[PDB]
Design a protein around this ligand. Structure first.
Ligand SMILES: *[C@H](C)[C@H]1/C(=C/c2[nH]c(/C=C3N=C(/C=C4\NC(=O)C(CC)=C4C)C(C)=C\3CCC(=O)O)c(CCC(=O)O)c2C)NC(=O)[C@@H]1C
Ligand SMILES: *[C@H](C)[C@H]1/C(=C/c2[nH]c(/C=C3N=C(/C=C4\NC(=O)C(CC)=C4C)C(C)=C\3CCC(=O)O)c(CCC(=O)O)c2C)NC(=O)[C@@H]1C
Ligand SMILES: *[C@H](C)[C@H]1/C(=C/c2[nH]c(/C=C3N=C(/C=C4\NC(=O)C(CC)=C4C)C(C)=C\3CCC(=O)O)c(CCC(=O)O)c2C)NC(=O)[C@@H]1C
Ligand SMILES: CCC1=C(C)/C(=C/C2=NC(=C\c3[nH]c(/C=C4\NC(=O)[C@H](C)[C@H]4CC)c(C)c3CCC(=O)O)/C(CCC(=O)O)=C2C)NC1=O
Ligand SMILES: CCC1=C(C)/C(=C/C2=NC(=C\c3[nH]c(/C=C4\NC(=O)[C@H](C)[C@H]4CC)c(C)c3CCC(=O)O)/C(CCC(=O)O)=C2C)NC1=O
Ligand SMILES: CCC1=C(C)/C(=C/C2=NC(=C\c3[nH]c(/C=C4\NC(=O)[C@H](C)[C@H]4CC)c(C)c3CCC(=O)O)/C(CCC(=O)O)=C2C)NC1=O
Ligand SMILES: CCC1=C(C)/C(=C/C2=NC(=C\c3[nH]c(/C=C4\NC(=O)[C@H](C)[C@H]4CC)c(C)c3CCC(=O)O)/C(CCC(=O)O)=C2C)NC1=O
Ligand SMILES: CCC1=C(C)/C(=C/C2=NC(=C\c3[nH]c(/C=C4\NC(=O)[C@H](C)[C@H]4CC)c(C)c3CCC(=O)O)/C(CCC(=O)O)=C2C)NC1=O
Ligand SMILES: CCC1=C(C)/C(=C/C2=NC(=C\c3[nH]c(/C=C4\NC(=O)[C@H](C)[C@H]4CC)c(C)c3CCC(=O)O)/C(CCC(=O)O)=C2C)NC1=O
Ligand SMILES: CCC1=C(C)/C(=C/C2=NC(=C\c3[nH]c(/C=C4\NC(=O)[C@H](C)[C@H]4CC)c(C)c3CCC(=O)O)/C(CCC(=O)O)=C2C)NC1=O
Ligand SMILES: CCC1=C(C)/C(=C/C2=NC(=C\c3[nH]c(/C=C4\NC(=O)[C@H](C)[C@H]4CC)c(C)c3CCC(=O)O)/C(CCC(=O)O)=C2C)NC1=O
Lengths: 124, 162, 284, 173, 172, 162, 172, 172
């Protein structure tokens, strides 16, 4: 799954780490693993949970980000998330994604499965 | 810096749109307010030597140990008292700055940013300047609505100290 | 150079008359030649009256002395060493004597190598004799003509990498060259052997941001990555002074950004929100 | 950086470290009196914002016909739109500076890299200056004429607007 | 080095058209105010050395720490550096008054003064106070009528107060 | 650029001294010269379309081969004659520029620097524009002291062509 | 300043071994094509000034805004900067053809051209177009046989088209 | 981030041979002086905040213009920038003392400090003086024996005086 070209760029330093995460989110090796198996509202939640490193606030905001993804594509919704003012101020320009505050909160990798409860029912 | 003119500007910049009537009404709220605030600044600049003499002597009578205790931080020596009138002489500039600018910009950029950061290091108790400003709050001699506008900035500095 | 000379501050040198020394003696023209020597050789530093070298001047009045022998004698004088030679590195000086005695910034590093083995074997007082007794000095400066800056025009045979090392040398007419914030260290000793030519930064007010030096470990000028952007146009924008949110957010001001095309328009809007100023974007 | 006429005096009086002098407060009291004329001029531009973008565009693309001609820098419909969209961005940052009364907001956003960004882009700097100089004689002319309003001479205030476009023009071309 | 005339010339060169009639009407007014421009420039250089020393004493009183030891203008040499320099503001200001344009002021005396001080350690305030103490005395020298014919030059003296304010605000 | 105001400035700059009475007398020589030179510029700007039509037709009758010989350099095609009125239309601007500036600055900076450099490359004979300017020298229509002032810059351009 | 020969020398110096046999076999081929290299280099400098003016007219037609006022190559002084500097590409290209290596082309005419234009305001794209108009005419001048013996120069002319493409793509 | 051990490791990796006997004899001495290294590092971080304030007062007395308006450290915000920073020298110095190598000091606190100031306007002398006012007090804190066993560490304390002198001379 790992990309050779992207890894080389970081060492060179040509691409900012924030520009580097765009490679992994718009990677079709990543896209087959998560977009075939997950619905649109789960695609909001997984992108907030990993890239922004935050839990979603409510249900009504995964609905809010949903319209943009269908029209702008998966790349266009990721592009709007990474160029959000909230992402650029708090992570800053060159700092790897992480969870901001977890005083007593589940790790998100453990908390959220790569795929959804819907796609499991097709497998049965 | 923060000014309710530039507060209207920087808000319209992030949306990427022209100055509508939303940002425009924030301007004349600053404009009219200056006529009750500029002679609020004239009441302080004319009484400059009174208040820094008054607040410095008010600190010593409130805290009598600060003239006796040996230390650089205190006002036992002469250069402490020379640094005494420098500090409260520096407070009255920014209050006259933030009254003339009409916002809490110069109070943010020049006084209270890192003000709680330095006082932990040099063990300057902030309650010293609380009683210093409270003497200026009662003895600035200003009257009317203009005085009230001027006063908020004294109380805005006190809440930043605490 | 005109309307770039206003910005770079090189409009006074662009239309600058040669002083010469017509062989008839006159005190005023000699007085104005002497200001033209000490302004260029000492880098617009001031000369006080004990600093005047009045005994240097008596020889100048006589016919035998030639501005060329005078310029040898000001640089060998201990006054000129007190400002430049003692408070500086030896490579910086080899770089510096080309700015005063020759007028151009050093072209190759190999020119520099020759000077060190000359400086060791024959001393500094014979090094300045080798700057003056050069064919490039005699071709453009006569015996009776002051050295002026030749950094700007073509001076056929120049390399253009040396066109931009001259703008790293002096920051305007107004400057001392002891009064640049890297004053003691050689600004071009890294550039001469990396053999890259850094970015021209102009002086203050005409350019909104003068505060850009090339870093130690900075982003490469030409890059390979597509950088997420759908269309390959990639541009390399550097910022000069960033005083945005503190201790973890900005660990390093003046960092060079490499941003592709389609997010360049939002990128300039983020940098200005940080309060930074852009000295250069460059296609690569 | 975003500065006012007021914070211009503040940051200048901060560097000397003295109190604000009396004539500076006398000068700023005059800015209060001309404050309502400043809202007269700024409101008149943004009402005629889109009308002066299209009108200055036609006068530009007539008098330099090679731009929308093929091979030109503004030929295709995309670049064209960007150029068209941009001409608001001069006016966005000019009318910020008129309402600010200072050229600090104009300098670090719309002036700090425009003469920078064009060498990598191939856009012609001189042509752009002309485009902005075609805005200036129409933006002054829109705010000049009086219809259904009190008549006073701000000529000392309109010259600030003509200075702001001339600051925006000469920094690029 | 630009004039008021070559300001209009280089501006009319960029548009590539002939010189318009009102521009020649405006430049004809500069001819009429040309003799008042020589009135103001001749009055400064006659009082040049008197206004350098007088602005120096008012500076070094009101900031006493400069000629005090440890200060930036303490020793005799640097002190002459500052003293010699205060003419160089006035050298390039009265160039700009006689030019009628701020182009000569900008690329010689303004282009690197705020540059050169970070490497030098000279404070910003000292320069600003020093030039702003020249301005109220240079305007006051050219204002008073003694043995000259009375005229009106308030539209011309404001150019001089603008030139010092251009020189002051570009540094501090 | 060169102007006898700035000629007085740049001379006093290299000596590092104030504007004495030496440089000051060079100013009023420029000032009262403008009143015989500004209406010398008004005589050319009013007659703009006459002279560029007159000088272009004067070139063709002087050199009849330049309308017939096939080449880009010549005026056989239409775009040659379109570039004909551009060139002499460009000369009359700088003469009106250098009359208004009062010096040979704009003639130096905008016309004659590298003028002998390009004409060797594009094989444009300078004697073409010699006869072009000599028609303007005789048919400008200017008279009196002002005419003399407009007459030198025409002759200063001719000696730069040759 | 490097050759094809000193390219192999400095490469064989870094490994520190003797020169291998096939490297001498390859350099013996450069001796055989050495007379064709003087055929191509002599043909360019004979047509040097004719190809500067001819590529200039095709540039200044197809971008008319340059000569036009406000353009970067408007006045007669800058215009000579551009017109005569088109030789300097050709000066350093025909050096590299006779050298057979792009080292002389790189550190003189390529090392700071994309550098020097941001401070100058000369458009990068315009310069690239001009050199690419030289390339199709410089190849076409050396291609045609008139009064020379017929040979094959396809593998050598492609080096010349590579040298202009190296000079073009490093700027624009 | 390198040690004294990984200094020898990465040096022995480049030659590609086994670790020699005297190198293991030298590193065995670093084990014996290892407990004195924890004596010196623990004494600085216990007196960390006391030596920041004490070196700040001696700096801002002897250069009073920083404190004075117009200075680079005038306002309370910048003042905390400088004050907060003086720990960051000490944060990366005591890293290098416990590491025993200057590699961690070089690529974090030394690699861009002389870089970042030209864009910032912070003077070189102020920074250099402050670091050098830390050094004579940091050596003096670790020198005096009070309630510790007496030993000899003059060959180890000179490493600490070298680390501040490395930090000082790379900026000013
Ligand atoms: C249409 C016949 C009826 C209708 C449509 C309507 N919907 C909305 C708001 C939303 N629609 C969606 C739909 C989708 N999101 C998806 O990701 C996909 C699959 C790719 C679909 C079909 C969503 C998420 C919303 C929420 C907001 C959004 O646009 O992003 C509106 C706007 C309503 C509002 O803004 O409150 C409308 C008009 N509604 C009707 O009236 C018709 C009966
Ligand atoms: C202190 C003796 C002098 C001084 C310092 C000063 N620094 C700043 C601001 C910054 N300092 C740094 C330093 C670093 N960041 C790093 O990552 C490293 C490597 C470990 C260093 C050394 C940075 C990045 C900044 C940015 C601003 C910030 O505080 O976030 C200031 C403030 C400048 C301003 O404009 O606010 C100051 C004053 N100044 C003096 O006068 C002292 C002599
Ligand atoms: C129009 C008068 C002139 C012109 C313009 C032109 N611009 C572009 C491309 C861009 N312009 C910008 C400009 C800005 N970004 C900012 O943040 C600000 C300050 C608010 C400004 C003024 C940017 C970012 C781009 C590129 C990407 C993008 O716009 O999103 C082009 C495109 C050229 C091309 O080949 O792509 C053109 C043509 N063109 C002219 O000829 C006029 C003189
Ligand atoms: C512009 C806004 C502004 C203010 C007000 C300010 C205050 C300020 N006062 C300080 C010290 C001081 N402050 C005081 C003042 C006092 N101590 C006493 O004993 C009295 C109770 C009291 C006065 C009433 C003294 C005596 C010092 C020196 C203490 C020392 O050197 O340790 C210091 C640290 C050292 C310095 O640079 O001088 C700051 C930063 N700084 C600012 O930027
Ligand atoms: C006409 C264009 C022009 C300018 C403007 C100019 C300024 C100028 N001022 C300088 C120095 C200086 N400038 C000052 C000025 C001051 N220091 C203070 O603390 C005071 C507040 C202030 C005087 C009021 C001082 C003191 C120095 C000497 C610094 C030193 O010797 O360390 C230097 C460095 C060279 C030298 O000092 O010999 C230059 C170039 N030079 C020029 O050619
Ligand atoms: C054609 C040249 C010209 C101009 C520009 C002009 C403007 C102008 N605006 C005025 C008033 C005014 N203008 C405004 C405008 C506004 N206040 C706000 O807070 C709003 C945001 C904004 C409208 C969007 C207001 C509120 C007044 C008060 C006086 C009045 O009603 O006229 C007046 C009244 C007389 C005076 O001010 O001396 C003048 C002169 N008069 C002229 O002859
Ligand atoms: C205090 C404010 C003030 C100024 C500045 C002033 C100047 C002034 N200079 C004048 C004349 C003049 N000024 C000059 C000056 C010169 N001509 C040269 O060519 C020399 C280089 C230069 C002297 C060095 C001359 C020659 C005149 C002619 C008229 C006269 O003799 O007054 C006049 C006569 C009346 C008028 O011009 O309307 C005025 C008003 N009058 C004022 O009320
Ligand atoms: C701003 C001052 C200025 C002027 C005046 C100027 C003229 C000028 N005219 C030129 C060519 C030309 N000049 C002309 C003009 C003429 N040829 C004729 O046949 C007619 C007799 C005559 C007009 C009356 C023509 C037709 C060309 C194109 C010739 C060619 O392309 O070879 C050229 C060389 C190519 C160019 O860029 O277009 C220059 C530099 N340049 C300047 O910078
Ligand atoms: C869009 C097409 C285009 C090009 C290519 C162009 C080139 C051009 N290069 C110029 C100058 C220059 N050209 C160079 C370039 C060089 N000199 C050297 O020493 C090196 C050998 C060589 C680079 C490899 C330099 C250094 C200058 C400045 C010379 C001066 O100012 O006298 C000038 C005159 C002044 C100017 O505006 O900057 C033009 C017009 N103009 C154009 O419109
Ligand atoms: C430095 C002075 C000098 C020159 C100029 C020179 C050229 C030169 N070119 C030659 C051959 C040649 N030159 C060419 C060149 C070409 N044929 C084509 O059709 C292509 C378009 C073109 C290359 C692009 C060819 C094909 C030959 C055939 C003979 C050979 O391979 O050398 C030869 C072989 C010997 C001879 O002709 O007598 C000479 C002398 N020799 C010299 O001493
Ligand atoms: C003033 C110059 C000076 C220094 C610096 C000094 C230090 C010093 N620390 C020692 C011991 C020691 N020092 C430590 C310190 C520590 N071990 C840990 O694991 C902890 C993390 C850390 C304390 C936080 C320990 C554990 C010993 C063991 C021996 C003893 O108790 O003294 C000894 C015992 C004698 C010897 O080592 O030869 C010396 C000399 N003696 C001197 O004369």
């Amino acid at each position: 799954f790992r990309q050779g070209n992207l890894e080389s760029q970081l060492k060179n330093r040509a691409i900012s780490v924030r520009d580097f995460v765009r490679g992994l989110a718009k990677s079709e090796a990543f896209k087959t693993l998560v977009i075939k198996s997950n619905s649109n509202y789960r695609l909001v939640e997984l992108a907030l949970k990993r890239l922004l490193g935050r839990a979603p606030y409510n249900k009504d905001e995964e609905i809010a980000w949903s319209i943009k993804i269908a029209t702008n594509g998966w790349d266009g919704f990721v592009d709007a998330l990474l160029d959000s003012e909230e992402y650029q101020s708090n992570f800053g320009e060159n700092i790897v994604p992480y969870q901001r505050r977890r005083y007593k909160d589940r790790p998100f990798n453990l908390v959220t499965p790569r795929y959804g409860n819907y796609w499991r029912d097709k497998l049965e | 810096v923060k000014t309710p003119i530039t507060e209207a500007i920087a808000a319209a910049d992030t949306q990427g749109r022209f100055l509508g009537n939303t940002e425009l009404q924030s301007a004349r709220g600053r404009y009219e307010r200056a006529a009750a605030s500029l002679e609020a600044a004239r009441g302080l600049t004319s009484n400059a030597q009174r208040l820094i003499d008054g607040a410095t002597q008010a600190v010593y009578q409130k805290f009598p140990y600060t003239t006796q205790t040996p230390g650089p931080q205190f006002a036992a020596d002469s250069r402490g008292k020379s640094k005494c009138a420098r500090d409260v002489g520096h407070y009255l500039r920014i209050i006259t700055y933030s009254l003339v600018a009409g916002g809490t910009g110069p109070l943010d950029e020049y006084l209270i940013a890192g003000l709680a950061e330095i006082n932990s290091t040099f063990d300057l108790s902030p309650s010293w300047y609380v009683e210093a400003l409270k003497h200026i709050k009662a003895n600035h001699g200003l009257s009317g609505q203009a005085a009230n506008e001027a006063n908020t900035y004294i109380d805005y500095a006190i809440n930043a100290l605490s | 150079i005109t309307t770039a000379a206003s910005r770079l501050g090189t409009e006074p040198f662009s239309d600058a008359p040669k002083v010469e020394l017509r062989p008839k003696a006159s005190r005023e023209e000699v007085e104005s030649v002497i200001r033209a020597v000490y302004r260029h050789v000492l880098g617009n530093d001031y000369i006080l009256a004990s600093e005047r070298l009045v005994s240097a001047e008596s020889l100048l009045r006589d016919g035998n002395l030639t501005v060329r022998e005078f310029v040898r004698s000001v640089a060998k004088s201990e006054l000129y060493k007190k400002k430049f030679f003692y408070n500086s590195f030896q490579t910086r000086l080899i770089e510096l004597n080309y700015k005063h005695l020759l007028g151009r910034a050093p072209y190759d590093e190999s020119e520099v190598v020759y000077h060190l083995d000359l400086y060791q074997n024959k001393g500094y007082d014979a090094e300045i004799d080798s700057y003056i007794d050069s064919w490039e000095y005699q071709s453009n400066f006569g015996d009776n003509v002051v050295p002026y800056y030749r950094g700007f025009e073509t001076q056929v045979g120049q390399k253009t990498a040396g066109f931009n090392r001259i703008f790293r040398l002096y920051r305007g007419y107004a400057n001392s060259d002891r009064a640049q914030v890297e004053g003691t260290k050689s600004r071009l000793a890294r550039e001469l052997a990396s053999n890259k030519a850094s970015t021209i930064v102009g002086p203050s007010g005409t350019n909104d941001s003068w505060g850009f030096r090339a870093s130690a470990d900075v982003a490469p000028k030409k890059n390979l990555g597509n950088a997420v952007g759908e269309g390959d146009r990639v541009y390399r924008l550097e910022v000069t002074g960033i005083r945005s949110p503190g201790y973890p957010s900005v660990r390093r001001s003046s960092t060079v950004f490499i941003v592709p095309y389609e997010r360049l328009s939002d990128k300039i809007q983020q940098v200005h929100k940080q309060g930074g100023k852009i000295v250069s974007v460059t296609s690569a | 950086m975003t500065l006012d006429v007021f914070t211009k005096v503040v940051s200048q009086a901060d560097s000397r470290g003295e109190f604000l002098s009396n004539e500076q407060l006398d000068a700023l009291a005059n800015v209060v009196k001309e404050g309502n004329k400043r809202l007269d001029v700024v409101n008149r531009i943004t009402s005629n914002a889109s009308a002066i973008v299209t009108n200055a565009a036609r006068a530009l693309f007539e008098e330099q016909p090679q731009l929308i001609a093929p091979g030109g820098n503004a030929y295709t419909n995309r670049r064209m739109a960007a150029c068209l969209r941009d001409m608001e961005i001069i006016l966005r940052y000019v009318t910020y500076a008129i309402l600010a009364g200072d050229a600090s907001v104009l300098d670090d956003r719309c002036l700090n890299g425009l003469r920078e960004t064009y060498q990598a882009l191939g856009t012609p700097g001189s042509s752009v200056a002309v485009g902005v100089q075609k805005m200036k004689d129409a933006a002054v002319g829109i705010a000049n004429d009086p219809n259904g309003i009190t008549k006073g001479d701000c000529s000392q205030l309109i010259s600030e607007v003509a200075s702001y476009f001339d600051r925006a023009a000469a920094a690029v071309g």
